[PDB]
Structures are given as structure tokens and as C-alpha cells.
Amino acid sequence: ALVLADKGVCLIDEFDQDRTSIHEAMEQQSISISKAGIVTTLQARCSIIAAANPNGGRYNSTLPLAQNVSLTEPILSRFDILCVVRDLVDEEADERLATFVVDSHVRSHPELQRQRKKEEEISPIPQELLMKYIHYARTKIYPKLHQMDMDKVSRVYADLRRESISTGSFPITVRHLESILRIAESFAKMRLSEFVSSYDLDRAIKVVVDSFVDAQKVSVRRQLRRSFAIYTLGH
Amino acid sequence: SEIHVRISDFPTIYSLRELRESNLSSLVRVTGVVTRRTGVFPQLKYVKTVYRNYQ
Amino acid sequence: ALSPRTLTAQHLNKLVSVEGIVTKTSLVRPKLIRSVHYAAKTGRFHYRDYTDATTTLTTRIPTPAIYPTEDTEGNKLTTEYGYSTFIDHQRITVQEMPEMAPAGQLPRSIDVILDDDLVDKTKPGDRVNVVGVFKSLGAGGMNQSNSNTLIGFKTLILGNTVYPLHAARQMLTDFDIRNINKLSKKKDIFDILSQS
Amino acid sequence: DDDNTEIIKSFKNFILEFRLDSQFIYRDQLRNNILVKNYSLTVNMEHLIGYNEDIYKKLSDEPSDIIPLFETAITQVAKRISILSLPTFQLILNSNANQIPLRDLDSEHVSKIVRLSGIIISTSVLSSRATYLSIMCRNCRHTTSITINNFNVSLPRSCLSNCGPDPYIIIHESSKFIDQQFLKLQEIPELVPVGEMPRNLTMTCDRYLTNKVIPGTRVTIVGIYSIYNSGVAIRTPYIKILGIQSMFTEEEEEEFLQLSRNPKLYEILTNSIAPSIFGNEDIKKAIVCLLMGGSKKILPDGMRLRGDINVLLLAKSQLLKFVEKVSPIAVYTSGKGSSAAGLTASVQRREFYLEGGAMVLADGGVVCIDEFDKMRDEDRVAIHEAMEQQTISIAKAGITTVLNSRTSVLAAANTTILSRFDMIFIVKDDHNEERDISIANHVINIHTEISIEKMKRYITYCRLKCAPRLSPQAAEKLSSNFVTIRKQLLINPITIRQLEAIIRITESLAKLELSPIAQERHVDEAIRLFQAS
């Protein structure tokens, strides 16, 4: 169904041939096929957002990411952002969730000014304007990197690789660096800025480094976060 | 060589339930989801020759 | 001397030789060519002949395959099986060898007609070289059809001779018999042959 | 009636008179085509327009009627310049008119000359059409003939010589035919609207335009756009094509010979392989030996001696990609394979069938496996036959066949399976910050010694030209070393299957110099590089 996603977003909520198709889709940006002498090609050219259940009933934080998934290593290598979400225990968080849930439930009950109050309490931005804004930014804005700070980015990349090897972690790679630059462009595009800036690179570095840290075993995680404090929290 | 008039905002609507034999040859306004589509072909216009598109 | 890939419309009605692999074979069937009849009253034996497009190199008006029941002079006729003549018929298909297939392209093939002695001398998978006349058939849609005559005529090879290809057996000459008998009288033939 | 003669006269005078500067270009082309038994002419539209615009206007209004007249004019000219018999000549056209996108063709274009482009996706087999045809009349046995031409006919019913309602039959014994072929054109990939599958057309060609293109090629087409029979009052469209557009030298091998006599060629080739990767000298040397290979041999008693080389590597991802790029023929795969065939092959199902994996497909070339440990269960046992015998054999579910697996394997991972490989090594790393900074700077540059092609051609040349043999001194050296190692192990295993691998490595090393004989120099480096451990 990737043809219908051309220049759009592809959404996956649950999960061999399907995975094989996804392997080819992530490896390329175009799909090709042959049948009974016929040969033809198609375009995918889309962003993929996927979700999965971690190998049964519950995630295990003591283990690396691979133990908790039914995925090959190139999938985890080629995706830009990876994250794990868990049902943590906290009385205050539970109370906040329950209050919000019952409040939303009452707010949705079937039984102009009411709509305006409801809308403005719901969100800080009117979502019609946000959708138009997203379309405008996607069609109009095409940011570029600034060459000053990229020396610092290279040094940070080398430092992260050195620290990864030092503790015996799986190493960081050019895919992570490319993802950082692409995510920084996205941050620039979000404010309609044609220039990437230092804070964009900082935010992108934080996102990618935190995602990289979340994939690791617990002892490696502690060592990484102790060393990486000047990136994950500071800059 | 020829222009077609398109009518808009016809003030009454049916689903595909309410159509009956009384509606035959009358103008109707209908809504739905397009389930299937053929390819485009030419069609003979008059029965020297002229054609038009069809689908 | 050709192959199924290169057989071309220029070669129609010529005598050609082709090489390839047998892929399909039809069941053997009999075919009527002549029938004999006995007239009950007059005591005279009559006969007639039949033709079809694949039976003759030259072209003739087709025959309806009907048995005559009555004489010119009104006498009722009887058919004499065993005096009539029938012949065997079999169609096969020959394809270019896979070693010659270009670029993973679809392979090409020709149908061959066999009869009388040539029947059943091949089976699928045989590498074979066939000799025969390359000919066309049919109306090709010019007899009125919906196709607008874009479809082409049908074509065949009428099998005249068939030879196999070795791709096992050998046939001895007299000198081989002499050498084999002479060698057998050595004192230790078993050692010589085993060590060879 | 007279109009058919004047048009033919006009085109006949066009061919006989069109000079540009001093050469009657079309008289010369028509003569030069006949000498090689090519009966066609390639006219250009712009020259026709320049000569007389009225002729082009007539051609543009009614192509289907006027193209045959110009063809018979070509025949009438062809007879004068070569005879003091010929078939009818084929006209071919070239044009620069504006291309119509395939998606925009519609009812306004029926029976018009159209220029378009796309990708060929399929090709039919050749089929026979009739041009001259003979007829027999069933009742009176009178005979006649008809001349067909292939532009948009049925057998007549005006009986001759009553003679009956439908008496005519064909004498195929005395008739003439031509070739015909069908093709499918698909619209250009970079022109399709988003979210739609591409549209396509079907088309026809005959005589010299047949068998000119293959699937997957981008082409440009000139042809008449028309319809044919196959709703109410509705017909299918198609196109009739009138034109289509789509080993070493001496000076090359001189460079390769100059390289061959360089005293440091081995160092040069090793340095040229994955230059970004730091260290790992012996890995690069082993990859050179893998690319070059040994020499195949066949003996009087029919036994067959292998030529290929096999290597295993225990950073490593880059080298396999480089080997894929440099090699003349290469296949890349991960351990699970592209299908249920896996690496070797399998039987699948409804009748059963068989398909081969990425060992049969790489036959005659090189194959690299990205993670050898992810090999499937069947492939674990089948690779034994795939490597030792260079064949795969199956007898399952009535299938009984043998498959060829003649290839050199490179592999990487991270047991007894190591015995199949000629050499095994473990990749090593170094952590200089300058290297990473340089790589990052290059990455930012794209975001903001011998070259590959020359080396590939040189490898091809060496593989084609030379296949050296051992000298006697090498034989004595190798046998003495073999018995020495076995005695040393005995007093403290080496086997013939590894001696025959050392020989192949020695031959591959001698192959670089193009020396017809291998020598002790190569034997020493062979045993030196043999230290896998």
C-alpha cells in the first residue's frame, strides 16, 4: 500500500512478507517488481511512523532493545527516532490522568459560545490554523545548514564514538549524524526558518542521543548518561 | 465547437435508498463513495466521424 | 540450419533444420485417408480418398470426412474396414535450449507434426534435431472476424526426419572386437583395468 | 483516380532532387542501404517541410492513406538506381515536434501522427502477416491474387470465371509474408501524479522495426494513434509505430601492461581497496586474492579442479559493499535470503515448483553474505555441496534436477563450518579522532592508487588473458613444507584439502604479474598469508 503514501505519512499500529516489503521500503525510496516477463517501478517517498508491542505482555528494561522486539538490526539502524513508552506507577500521575480523563468525558457529553470556550481550553493553537500552517511550511520552507558550528558537531560525533567504544557499547554511526542534521532541518522548518541554528542542532543532538541511550543495557545506560550529561541535559 | 452547461446547488438530495420509478428521466442529486473506476476510452459520437471520451 | 529463436517469416515454404529440446507431446491418434465400400447388388468394390491441410505439401480443397451411404446408381453401400487405410498422427513442441536464452528473456518454441513411422520416437526432455518443411495454415482472420486482422497466421514444421543429440551408448566397430578379445588374454587384466 | 498518381510523382521527385550543399543525401542513402540488403529509407520531417510544405500538409492530414503511396514511390526510385526482385520498401520517420505526455492522449488525436516517450515493459513473440497472397476459386478452379498493406480488409466475395456465394480459398504454397510484433509502453516514472499507478499503452511494429528494443529501456516513439475493435459504440486505442530512438582496445591494454611491470603493484592494489578503512592489511591482500582467483584445470580421466577462492571475516560492513562495487559481477545478500529459497534453493507449493536462492543466481561471479550466522537450517547443510562441488542437487516431490553454483563466496559473522573456507580473519579497529572528524566533514560536505573502474577493467583483463602454472621448484618447496608441518604436529590438522587451497592462492598471486609460471616468491607470500589461525 506504499504507493498511496507518496509524499505523505505511513502509519503502522501493529505487526514475513510484510516485513520483507518494509525492508525493501526502508532500504530504498522506490519499489520495483516483475511478473511473467513484465517489469515496472513505483515510488514510496514517504515518512513511516510505526508502533509495536514489546515481545509479549511487558517490556524488560534490564535488557537491550533487540531482546524486546521481533526486528532485524538494519530496521533499528535505519529509523531516525526510537522510543519506549511504559505504564509507570505514581499516585500523582494517576490522579492527574484520571481527572483529565473524566473531565474530557464530561466535556464530550452530547447534552456557539460553548464551542469556542471548549476549543480554546482544549489547545493553545486553533488546529485549523495549525493544519494550514503545516501545509504552508511543507510547501514553502526549505532550510539550509550554517557552516560555522559544524566543526563542533564533528567533534561531538567523534567524542560520542570514543565514549561508546570505551564502555563497550555498540558504536554510533553516520546514520545518527545524518538523522541529527535532518531533524535540525525539521526544527528550522517548524518556525519557518530557512536557516538551521545552534539550538536546532542542540535539540536534534539531545533527541538522537537520548534515543540511542534508551536502546542500551542498564549498566551501559548508566555509564552513558553519566558521561553524556553535557549533551542530554547540558550543551 | 460546443459548450456544456453544468448545473450546481440543486436544492433536493437523495441517497441510493429513496430512488423509485417516479424519478425516471428527472434530475437528481446523489452522494456516495466511488467504489470502482474503468479506464478512459473513446466513443463514437454520431450514428465522416467524430468521437468523445467515455468512462 | 536454424534454431527456434531465429526462425523467421522469410523462411516460409523452405526446407529447414532446427535444434532444441522437446517440451510437450500429444497422444497418438489415427487418421483416415482412404475408405473402401462394397456395393450389395452389383458386386463392385468402390473407394474414395480424403485430404487435410497437414497431409500434403501441395494444397487442395478440403474433404468433409463423411462416409458415402448410397451409390450413384442408388445401390445401398457397406463400409469395409480392414481394407480402408488409416495412419498415425502426433504433434510435439520444440523449444530453444536454455543455454542460449538471452538476458533472462522468455524462450521461444515451435510445433512439429509427425506421422507414420516417426511417431513416439521422442519423449519430453530430449535434445533433438528436426528436418522438415516450414509452412503456414488457416485463414488468419481474413475470413470475417472481430480482430481487425491484427492477429497473424498460424505456422508449423512438417516433420520429415528426426535425429537425436548426445548431450549413453556407443556402437563397436570390428577393430574394437578384435582389440577387446586380444586384451582379455593378458595375465592380469583385472589389475590393468582397475588401476586405469 | 489521377490524385494517386500525382502524389506518387511528387514524392518520387522529392527523393531524386533534395540537395543540401552538394550531396544528394537520399539518393546516396537509398543506394547504400540496398548494398547491405536493407530495404528501407529514413526520411526526416524537417527536410520534407523545407522542400515543399504542401506535401507535408497532405501527409499530416491523412497519414493512413498517404504513407503507402510514398512507400511505393520509394520502390520506383529504388529500381532505377540499381537495375539496368525487390520487395516494397519501409518508410521510417524522424521528427522534433512537441512531445505529448502519454496521460493526455484522448479522442482529439485519433488518426494523427503523435510523438511520445516512455519505458518499454513487455515484448511479444514475432508473428506473420501477409502482403502478397494468392487465391483459388473453389467451383471453377480459377485463380487470382491480392496485395495487402498493413494500414487502417477481408477475403472478397465477387466470384469470377454461377460461380457461387463464397468460393475463395488461399494457396499458402505461393504467398509472401512479413514479421509483426507487439509492445507495451508505460508512462515516465517522474511524470505520474502522486498516489496513482502509472498508465500504459499497446503498440505494433513490423519488418525492420521488429526486435529492436528490450524490456526496461526508456524510448521515444513516433507513430499514428488509432483505434481497433475488441458498453456501446466503444473501441480500444493503440499506436502504429513509425520510428524508435533509445573487449579492449590496444591503448587500453598498454596501460594494463605498464601496470603489470610496476615493481610495487601488489602494494598499489592493496592500498586501493577500501582506502577509508584504517589498517587491516592482510584483509585487503586476501580480498585481492579473492578477486583474482586461481586457475581451472581438467584432466584426462575427467576429474575437474576448482579455481575459486573463499574467505570469511570475523567496519566489516563497508568491505562487502566495496567488493560488490569493484567486482565485475557481484551479488549482495543477508543470511535470511531474498525469498523462501534462502541462500541455496528450496521446493515450494497446487503443483510443486523449485526456485534457487543467492548461490545459483550469482553463478559465474562473486557473492557476498552480510551475516553468515543468520543462515537458515536447510542452507547450513546445503552450502556443503554448494561450496565443495560447486553444485546444488535436489530430489524432492518428483523434482529431480542439479543446479550450478560456480562462484567465489565472501562472508562475515559476529564450529566446523570454518573448514569450508580457504582463509579466515578477524577485523581490527583503531579509534583516531581525526579519522572520525574527516568522515564527519565529508558527510557535511555531501549534506551541504587506482580508481574503481580502471581496477575493475584491469581485473577483467587479467582474468581473461592469463592462467599460470607451478614451476618444479615451487612443487618441491610446497611438498617439503607440507610434510614438515605434519611431522611437527605429529611430534606435538593439515590435510590435502588445504594444500590444494595454498596452490590456488599461489596461482592467484602469480596472476597479478601476468607471469605464465608461478615461482618461490609467490609460494613464500602464499604460506605467509596462510596464517589465518
Next chain:
Amino acid sequence: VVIEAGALMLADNGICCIDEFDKMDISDQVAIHEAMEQQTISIAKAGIHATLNARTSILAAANPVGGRYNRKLSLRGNLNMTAPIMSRFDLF
């Protein structure tokens, strides 16, 4: 396809009763799971596409594994039912 309605379509705005749920094949349990997730049914085959509404509430009966319940074990251990389907029953 014959399209003709199944059981869940007839129970639209009604109670659908499944008896001996545990004997149902996994390949059909997933179908009931997909319908229950959305209250919607989808058809796409042979050039025919359709979408239908399935606002039906489910009432199910099942046997514990081994025929007798084990007080030592959770209900998940006792019941031969996958966790996503178990998560969507309001009451056990």
C-alpha cells in the same frame, strides 16, 4: 462473498453470543478482535470493496485449560486467550 452478511452484522445494535470460545481457531479469533477494535467490518476482493458497521456487544463463554480452574494461577494462565483479546472484555 457469494456479498452476504455474517453473524456480527445481524447482531448490529445487539448481543452476539459465542459459546465455547476457547475452541475457536486463532485465525478467526483475530478476525473477531479486528471487528471488536473498530466496530467496523471491511471487504476488499475480486474488484469489490465495501465497509460496514458492526456496533455489536459480545457475550462469550470459555473453558479453563485442562477443564478445571487452577487457584494457584492467574486467569491468563488458566485461559487459552491472547492478551489483546483479554484486554477488551469489560468484565470477567
